[PDB]
Amino acid sequence: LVYPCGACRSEVNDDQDAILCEASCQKWFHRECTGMTESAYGLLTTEASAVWACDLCLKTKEGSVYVFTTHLANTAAEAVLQGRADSILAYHQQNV
Ligand SMILES: [Zn+2]
Ligand SMILES: [Zn+2]
């Protein structure tokens, strides 16, 4: 099969950091095509109860587990790294 990046349209390969808009548009995105940080990527992909939503799905409220936009994933991860949140789910819980 082939999996075109939802933003740049080239193939997303297994050796590339990538996230899936799995609860909506069903497209893979290269991490660097989304604005997501490395830390947000590492923490979100490790959390099986978390799903990510891409910017185009957010724009039309497509589809309307814990849901993170790129911005929420970034800020939750920064709080984790700073020792200000115990985990990205704990941050989501507190902040919505
Ligand atoms: Zn891409
Ligand atoms: Zn999407």
Author numbering: 326 to 389, 235 to 266
The authors write:
To further explore the underlying molecular mechanism of this communication, we solved the crystal structure of the human PHDPygo2–HD1B9L complex. The purified complex yielded crystals under multiple conditions, and its structure was solved at 1.9 Å resolution. The overall structure is very similar to that of PHDPygo1–HD1BCL9 (with a 0.593 Å rmsd for the core Cα backbone  compared to that of 2VPB13). Like other PHD fingers, PHDhPygo2 binds to two Zn2+ in a cross-braced conformation involving two pairs of anti-parallel β-strands, followed by an α-turn and another β-strand flanked by two α-helices. It exhibits two distinct protein-interacting surfaces on opposite sides: one for histone binding and another for HD1 binding. Secondly, α2 is positioned so that I258 and L259 are in contact with the base of the A1 pocket, namely, with PHD residues T371-A375, which flank the connecting loop between α1 and β5, apparently buttressing the pocket.
Pygo contains a single zinc-coordinated PHD finger in its C-terminus, by which it binds directly to a short Lgs domain [called homology domain 1 (HD1)]; Lgs in turn uses its homology domain 2 to bind to Armadillo, thus forming a ‘chain-of-adaptors’.7,10 How Pygo and Lgs assist Armadillo as a transcriptional co-activator is unclear. Vertebrates have two orthologs of Pygo and Lgs: Pygo1 and Pygo2, and BCL9 and BCL9-2/B9L (referred to as B9L), which contribute to efficient β-catenin-dependent transcription in human colorectal cancer cell lines with high Wnt pathway activity. To our knowledge, Pygo PHD fingers are the only ones whose histone H3 tail binding is regulated by a co-factor ligand, namely, the HD1 of BCL9 proteins: human BCL9 HD1 significantly increases the affinity of human Pygo1 PHD for H3K4me, while Lgs HD1 is essential for H3K4me binding of Drosophila Pygo PHD. Here, we explore the molecular mechanism by which mammalian HD1 assists PHD in binding to histone H3 tail.
